Point group: C2
Chain length 436, copies 2
Amino acid sequence: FQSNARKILEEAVSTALELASGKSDGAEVAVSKTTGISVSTRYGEVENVEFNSDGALGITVYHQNRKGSASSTDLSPQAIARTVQAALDIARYTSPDPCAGVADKELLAFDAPNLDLFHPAEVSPDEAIELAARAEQAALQADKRITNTEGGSFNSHYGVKVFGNSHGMLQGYCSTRHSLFSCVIAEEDMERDYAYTIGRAMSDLQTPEWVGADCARRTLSRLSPRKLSTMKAPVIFANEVATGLFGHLVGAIAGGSVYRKSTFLLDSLGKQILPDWLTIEEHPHLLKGLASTPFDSEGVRTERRDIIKDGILTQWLLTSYSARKLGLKSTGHAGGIHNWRIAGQGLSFEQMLKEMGTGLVVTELMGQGVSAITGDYSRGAAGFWVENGEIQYPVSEITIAGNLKDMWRNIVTVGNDIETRSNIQCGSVLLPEMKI
Amino acid sequence: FQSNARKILEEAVSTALELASGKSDGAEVAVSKTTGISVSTRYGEVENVEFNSDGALGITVYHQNRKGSASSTDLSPQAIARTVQAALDIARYTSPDPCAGVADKELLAFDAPNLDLFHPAEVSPDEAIELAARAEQAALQADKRITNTEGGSFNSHYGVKVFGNSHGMLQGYCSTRHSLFSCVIAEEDMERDYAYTIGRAMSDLQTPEWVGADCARRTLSRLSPRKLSTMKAPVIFANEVATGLFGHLVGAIAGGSVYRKSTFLLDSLGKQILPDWLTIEEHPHLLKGLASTPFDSEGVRTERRDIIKDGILTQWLLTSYSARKLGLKSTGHAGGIHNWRIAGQGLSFEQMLKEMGTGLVVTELMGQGVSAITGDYSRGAAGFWVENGEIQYPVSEITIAGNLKDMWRNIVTVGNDIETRSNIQCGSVLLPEMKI
């Protein structure tokens, strides 16, 4: 009957819209329901297995340009009725906003593309427990120095999403996500690290044995870290933290903070903020993409674009509201970015180390030191020290401090070792000599 | 009809139990539903107002000593049916655990005390917007140096919780929580800090004006921080971070990690881990308490106890499972601690500064450097430098490093300036001279 979840949610949406139709000028309703299994293995203990159903119905109602908003995790008929009633009532207490309303009819995806996001695992619950347990065992076995387990785990979920609005849009789609992980502790002083694999289809996942081995390799690599004196060094952001480095851009080009005049990129539109060979491509329509979407949280059509082209920032990321505040049309960004890709410059991670030849590789960062207003950047870091093109030893208690404007603009190169498990996908990046 | 939420949830619980009764040896069902309003003010902008209903039904099913577990956010009749069915099926795939089952009948609270947790706000939605806006305005007005707002906010929620199990327990209760906050940015370099107030009744909350003023005082205090060289100094944990310092104890005395032999306190039961004048009292039955509870996540009766008495650790914190693994009875700790109180030694914060006379006051900490296995402690810190019994200036980029065993045992004193907004409540604590 989960084969019927889409038709169940379509009723929830259209019932909500009907209830609201007479009492409002416009309304937007979104439902999603994500269900599936979480397995947790602790070596030499009973595994824990759960079935989780987590869902929401959001509604936004517009009356006299006054916005009500209500959301309910409970999808029963009376619960939807109360939520709708709550939005309507709230809209009686709020200040009118001529910039507020349903998304422009011409931008809605009335017929939404099939993105092939749905790949249900055919796995036994027992089979899933063995996956999780196998990953944990691979890690624990790899070295004598690994004395502890935080466990293995497996997750498989299928989501169903439906959006509708009073312009007459009703569209919905299904998706799947599976993952496998393990976490262990190694001792010499003490370190803990994890490894994982993720994908929309089971065939996209790495083996348990790969995850354990990788989990062991990482944790063992971190053992007995040294400290650096303050110095000038070039710096590599390993692909896993490099993605987050470009991730800061999202907040700085957000339409919301633009009209609020709160981003350090406010004057930068159409200007080069990054090296001239670097292009950030957005592919919201990618088949089976981790971040792929048929339409955004407002039902707006979603678009293939280079957000950055030859180093130049081409566009803001806009919703209906921030587009209207800026006198533009929404870019289909309500709810975030969909699938960023940054091409490598033709080298491996190992080739970059040889390239740099002495410097820091940052494999992990801590805290928020990153200001959207000023572009100021200060973050705790750990990683490896490199000499002669080869990693010497792990290091920690480091601070990476700069401005994102300067960091971004002066990037030396980006690698081909691509982190594929995230929304934003790129390789390691080499920064010019800085203070660390 | 939210005046009927308790009777609605009791049906959800007992229907679940009936569905499971024929297919299992024992079952435990918990429902909660929390609803209310979130207001967000951004100075010179349209406020955002929402109604949120967030809920869950958890179920644990036991068959042939095999445990199934399922949970659903959707409380509709068919959703409960599927969740129950999912637990039952999962229990066919899992390994039997003779330590697993329903809580001991003799420990369940069949007739649960009234803890007076329910104090619905009588506030207009418009009135709530004014509260949030007033807090933000108080802060923005206090000083020229405050150039930015992250906004004010107001939240008011009433929860309903019902537990039932196949031993025939069915009990439920209602609660309320209200809060008011603001966050601003001050400039000279740039800092941001927040302030808040919280309580079960509106009459427990501070005025908007108090929150704004406090928010300004904090943010302005952090401006232009200096750095210390590595040195020996005594250290105060300001009450707000002091609570978290005792909070680490919870993980170290947890029954789960005891039977796993994974805590540095494993051998410490009945032994002095803290100064002989210090007593940690647990008052789970406190009228209107922030953490008060009529019974725990297993329906077990909850108990007034000194977890630490004259510096000595008296008991583990146990659930049904970990009690059974340890050959004991549950302490009513499933789901955490309820209301910790630590008495002050008779001095104010100002008296402690005079007392110390030179040293560090830590007002905030970053990251997890705290190991439950080893008791090792390393954390980023910020705060004030103190000389002559008076704060000199703000400082940052500090690392607090020790072992919790040594830190706890050697605490010099704890203040009377009590942080009352948290589960654990105590004043500032003075640590002996350490490396910072």
